Design a protein around this ligand. Structure first.
Ligand SMILES: OC[C@H]1O[C@H](OC[C@H]2O[C@H](O[C@]3(CO)O[C@H](CO)[C@@H](O)[C@@H]3O)[C@H](O)[C@@H](O)[C@@H]2O)[C@H](O)[C@@H](O)[C@H]1O
Lengths: 718, 718, 143, 146
């Protein structure tokens, strides 16, 4: 009774064990069969108790599992926990049945990777049941044909007659037979998101998580098990990505016998879910990638999958517009005239989109006001949004708009009309982040209001781009529309609310390109990517700081979603002064755009901008849709390097960066990846090199002085 | 508004911040005053919300705290969590008052370090309160005078009108300003407890814990923060020791701004506690030790504190008897005359105590019955316990007894009479560990029964030693005597019951030496030490295996409590053969005893055994009550070495071990510690050497082949 | 050091095999093992002395050592594993292989048929054993 | 005369040197290594085989230092103490993957196996007869084969 999923060139094997226990067998490089699945030593481990008195070699404490519970002989951390009306927490899921079918189901009220044709994937659903309490859990497995991807999630259902309180409901859990690995997660903060941290495993618990109601800048919902010797170019890697934008827990526990349990899902902390008879609960999915091609092999799988089978809309496969954003340029101090007058210059430079950022609404002259009042400031924009958008359109420029619809200012019309529409708890002070509060997206009336309000704004002007921002994390989490026993469900219901709001709004406007934002990359997760196919990577726009942030972000997320802007110097976040050329090379390594005051630019700088725009337009398709290879890590030394390669490996773009200059420095050489050994490539300006020479020997690098230098080479097969 | 605790050579500083918030300031080497406590950048951190909207530079997400809560601006893991009747989990403790007095309070129904006189320590009680709900929390701080010891614990009291659910109640929490450390915990398993593991911190969460209802073989309730360069002999070390024998969480969280939060206490997992209006909850204490003299300096503080101010009873300061366990010589199948016959020759060898092991009661002919039926088996012991003991006494030997009162066999009179007296949950199969169930010590009827039954046994014979064992961990945790809303209090109430049972039984028999046991060192924790002055370290008695186990155990626990017995070869646990010489040396480096069939011993082996007993009596006071220094780590190489030094540094005993033999090996040397460099030392049978030479230069170790060797030097000042 | 005869043979059979000890001092049960050791080595001598050699586990990096010999056509192989110091209640052991044909199945003498990919990519579960200085050897033949 | 041989089926390059005095003066060879090669970079570990009697050829992996590292013999024999073999390996290279550069000396007497990293991060690997306590006179017409 063995289950065997074939994902790309990887195998995921499970089997039934004894009285309907579901056991994990193997996840790794594709094997035709796992014949030794039951041929392992059966031991009576001291202090591992027994559910079956007739066989003391069997314990749940020593069985590799797919969805373990605590209480009936397993002492490791459970993937789920349920409290009964009697107060006990013992549950006992046994195999009930299963089904296999081509394709991939939609998950209720949630984002998920999808397929366009049934042949793209295969789905396995294993239904488990606890007969005593009527609890049924359907474990969902999906294997893509094309990629080494296994997606996992679980669906709880109360088919009994009692109330069932879910204390914990993780999406997945898997017991590795050994624990000789390092783990990688992506810790950070505002202005420095997703730094790569590699650590050895400990005997105990290690976890990245979020209790912020948002996936957060502080810890990104991604962990990975990597072989001790694995790097960017080789070695076994096991990726775990969470398709959800709220609270999460990503945990690895190593037990007394050297087994490693990796579990991921909605953070159990401050979380409960009540299941009345007949009610169900669907967890978000976790996308699991195996690679033996090292970190690049893993990332390249995530890039393709997320770009073509998670991101949606009309712009999913379209090249993204080069934009100018006015936030760093003017902040709140702007008007219609200053924007329209500079637009002519912007069009001349080759810019394709003008984005009006924060401050266009209500009395938004600072960050302490008017959130929730999405009416145009007639003083700042006399002709309104429609006037500005049309003026901008006439110059051959698209018009974009910034919104932050999940928020409400205490000093606003909306809050004076509906003070109870925010997240709060009875009789407690309402803490503020950036002088704002969070709207209760768990309430339907609030969600209905937002959908209608924002739709009116988006329909009042020829807007073809929206920047959906969110600049605060939840405190005093609660809702006045939920009973006491469902209060702990507030944070998740909020996220379900937001997903529904975004789904409806984005579907009402198929011609709009939505970019998600959260004070930078505070919600750069797969869940948001499903609703908005690109993201503002970070508020830190410094070329050097962006080396780490973009390198780290590229670990999971496709370049097409990674927004990057050239900003002014001295940089507004760190004060660093880098040349325009270097700033361009870093921004052109992502979703290229601008964010600076053009009226303060010299003719030389404006002329360099025009050439930057022309160049990026020439390599845009390659950058945003080509294959990405990381070459030199800014976390390991003084250099950063990467390259983009087309599908047929005929064209390539190479980018190199050295931050700190060293006097009388050694000669440097860059080796490339992903090129065809049997072909020659003309490096633009250098000469014809062999594909093998560029990969096995590398190219000598020009000796250069000064800090923060950059170099780009266009490669073309000959 | 600065609190300054002064413990030995250490300082612990706190201050009131703004509107009655309690902030952490400093914990380290003693300073007269911390004048820069408020002189730090008051920064506005992005996404760190403000309890006061007017001031963006204040946030609980960025305040170093003493007892942090979640929900009102802090996003790090909290020290405590309370759920209200309205479903919310938001609380807000503010400073109310504080009291300072000489001495140290006893904790209600719990073990704790103590004082014999007021002047030994100073206690600070900070009273916090959430006026909205009438929740009063008293933070208890005690600072010893002669030791760098700070003890912390919290006492909850509901002075409100509504009921409150503690979802989490840790004993302490502390935020270090920086996080550039490693951490040390003691993972393990049965037969290999408390191995030392040193790991670098991760930006995120690390933890050691136990969900087994017992402190466990798998993770000892102890963690430490150590400086990156700290070793056994030098460097800053911060130790955390939990005085509790049930479930625990020992966690270190590192946040976005390089802060490290260390928190410890009863495991929040599967735990709640209901506070009706007027009810209290006292947490166990955590003992916090600082040292700048490496891991030895930390351990030596723990050893002295725990041996003289935690352990209790008539045997606290008394030398512990060399005992023999005749278990492996007969197993269950023994009788009165078989015991008295071998006891005669054991008295000839110099043994002082004979321990009658499992099988003496009910129908214990195997490990499958009779647990709970604590009456003398008249088939095996026709003259009862009193008959056997008095025969043992008239040989000059003490009589000891083995019991396991926390357990009940399904096949027993007790279970047939009271099947509901075990830990269980309705309608669920009662899982067994080693063919037995666990008695529900959360109930008073069970506790009162055990107390009386065990007392009758201990009073029926001249028994001066009791080995209290427990060979199974809790499953299906629940109580038929508890209402559904208190079910999750079962495990903790179990431990409170066991603490009360042990307390009353040990009180009734002051002339008895109690040794706690749990399949080896399954509860080798400070809580048990309070009730029983010594503990059986491990069921693995193999000399080489014992090196790591004893090295690790000594990190927190004194040698006086660390049982070590000589056993037969080939070893029953690993199958290793090591000579009796080294088996003796390993065991003499702890609380010495024997566990082997003497009838199967050769005349050579019986000769050496006589010398070992004679030798240990000479060095017993030094080993059991001297200062302990670790010299070579079995976790770091092929060797192991440690030494005992008297308080006046006039005597010392050195032990050295080498595991694998190396052909044509380099000459080895061993540097000592703890000696007075001004004096010269007589090494018996070797010569006189200066203390400086022994410490700064070292002793040349004799070249020797064959595996698993050992050496012992006796040192005496001139 | 006192190691078993099986262990010593397994180590010596991983090189140019021979003997250097006093046969007159050996027991009868020991002599019968020598006969088997000599016989066994002859069966695999060509493979051992002329096959392709792969190191799997380093004794410089831990408590284990393991290597294997593979025929030039990858149809025959021989695997040796060694653990030095035993530990009580030890975790389960697994050994991955190298140099096998992935597209073929192999029959391990004493165990059964296993896929070549399975042995190399998943590995094989090792028997739980106590006592110091242990060794195991397995002949592999493609089906 | 620098001698290079490249095998067809194996990744093997062999190197040796042949001296010859065609002039009219005496020539004393103070040093005559078999080969020497300059790597463009020095980001490698190095492996050599140190040992003793009863424990020959233990594997030792070390990072490179900026300066001189060497395994050698002055015993008139290749010796137990150091085997005439060194290797440059990539930092992440192991038994099953990664770039490795082996250097094996076909000689049974004294040897010098040296790696030298200079100020510009290049790594000079040189091997041959140990120059220590070694000279060789070449009269006009005489030759020397390494
Ligand atoms: O409002 C437009 C702006 O909003 C988003 O980001 C704003 C970002 O800025 C703040 O960071 C700072 C740093 O301390 O915080 C203070 C005030 O809170 C500001 O002076 C300063 O900028 C906020 O704290 C963050 O909450 C917030 O993320 C968006 O990312 C921007 O692109 C832009 O649209």
């Amino acid at each position: 009774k063995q289950f065997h999923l074939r994902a790309g060139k990887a195998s995921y094997v499970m089997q039934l064990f004894r009285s309907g226990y579901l056991a994990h067998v193997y996840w790794g490089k594709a094997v035709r069969d796992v014949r030794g699945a039951r041929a392992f030593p059966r031991l009576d481990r001291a202090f591992s108790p027994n559910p079956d008195p007739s066989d003391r070699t069997f314990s749940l404490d020593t069985l590799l599992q797919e969805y373990p519970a605590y209480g009936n002989t397993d002492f490791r951390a459970p993937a789920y926990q349920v409290q009964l009306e009697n107060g006990s927490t013992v549950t006992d899921l046994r195999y009930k049945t299963h089904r296999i079918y081509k394709g991939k189901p939609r998950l209720n009220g949630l984002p998920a990777t999808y397929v366009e044709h049934e042949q793209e994937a295969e789905t396995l659903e294993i239904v488990l049941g606890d007969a005593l309490i009527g609890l049924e859990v359907t474990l969902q497995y999906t294997a893509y044909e094309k990629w080494n991807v296994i997606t996992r999630s679980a669906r709880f259902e109360n088919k009994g007659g009692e109330r069932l309180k879910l204390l914990r409901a993780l999406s997945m859990s898997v017991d590795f037979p050994t624990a000789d690995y390092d783990w990688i997660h992506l810790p950070g903060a505002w202005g420095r998101e997703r730094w790569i941290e590699r650590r050895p495993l400990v005997t105990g618990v290690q976890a990245a998580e979020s209790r912020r109601g948002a996936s957060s800048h502080q810890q990104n919902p991604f962990i990975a098990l990597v072989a001790k010797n694995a790097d960017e170019h080789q070695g076994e890697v096991y990726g775990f990505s969470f398709v959800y934008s709220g609270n999460f827990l990503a945990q690895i526990e190593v037990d007394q016998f050297g087994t490693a349990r990796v579990s991921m899902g909605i953070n159990p902390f401050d979380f409960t879910w009540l299941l009345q008879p007949g009610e169900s609960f669907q967890t978000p999915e976790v996308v699991m990638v195996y690679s033996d091609q090292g970190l690049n092999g893993m990332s390249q799988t995530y890039h393709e999958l997320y770009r073509t089978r998670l991101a949606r809309g009309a712009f999913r496969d379209r090249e993204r517009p080069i934009l100018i954003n006015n936030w760093e340029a003017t902040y709140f101090d702007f008007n219609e005239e200053k924007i329209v007058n500079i637009a002519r210059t912007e069009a001349e430079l080759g810019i394709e989109l003008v984005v009006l950022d924060d401050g266009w609404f209500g009395e938004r002259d600072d960050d302490r006001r008017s959130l929730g009042d999405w009416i145009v400031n007639r003083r700042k924009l006399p002709n309104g949004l429609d006037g500005l958008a049309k003026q901008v359109n006439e110059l051959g420029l698209q018009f974009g708009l910034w919104v932050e619809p999940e928020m409400v200012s205490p000093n606003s019309e909306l809050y004076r009309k509906h003070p109870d529409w925010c997240l709060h708890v009875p009789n407690r002070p309402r803490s503020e982040g950036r002088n704002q509060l969070v709207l209760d997206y768990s309430r339907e009336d609030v969600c209905d209001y937002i959908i209608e309000t924002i739709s009116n704004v988006l329909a009042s002007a020829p807007i073809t781009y929206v920047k959906w921002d969110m600049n605060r994390h939840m405190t005093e989490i609660g809702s006045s529309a939920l009973p006491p026993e469902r209060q702990r469900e507030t944070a998740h219901r909020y996220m379900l609310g937001l997903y529904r709001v975004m789904d409806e709004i984005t579907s009402r406007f198929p011609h709009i390109l939505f970019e998600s934002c959260s004070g930078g990359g505070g919600r750069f997760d797969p869940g948001m990517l499903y609703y908005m196919p690109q993201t503002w990577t970070s508020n830190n726009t410094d070329a050097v700081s962006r080396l780490k942030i973009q390198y780290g972000t590229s670990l999971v997320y496709p370049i097409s979603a990674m927004g990057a802007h050239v900003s002014a110097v001295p940089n507004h976040q760190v004060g660093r002064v880098a040349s325009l050329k270097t700033r361009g090379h870093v921004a052109m390594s992502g979703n290229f755009g601008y964010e600076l005051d053009i009226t303060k630019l010299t003719e030389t700088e404006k002329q360099m901008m025009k050439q930057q725009v022309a160049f990026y337009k020439d390599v845009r398709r390659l950058v945003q849709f080509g294959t990405f290879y990381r070459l030199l890590s800014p976390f390991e030394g003084n250099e950063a390097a990467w390259m983009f390669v087309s599908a047929d490996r005929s064209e390539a773009l190479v980018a190199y960066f050295r931050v700190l200059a060293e006097a009388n420095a050694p000669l440097s050489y860059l080796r490339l990846k992903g090129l065809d050994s049997n072909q020659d490539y003309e490096i633009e300006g250098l000469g014809v090199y062999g594909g093998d020479e560029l990969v096995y020997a590398g190219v000598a690098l020009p000796y250069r002085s000064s800090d923060f230098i950059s170099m780009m080479w266009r490669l073309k097969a000959v």
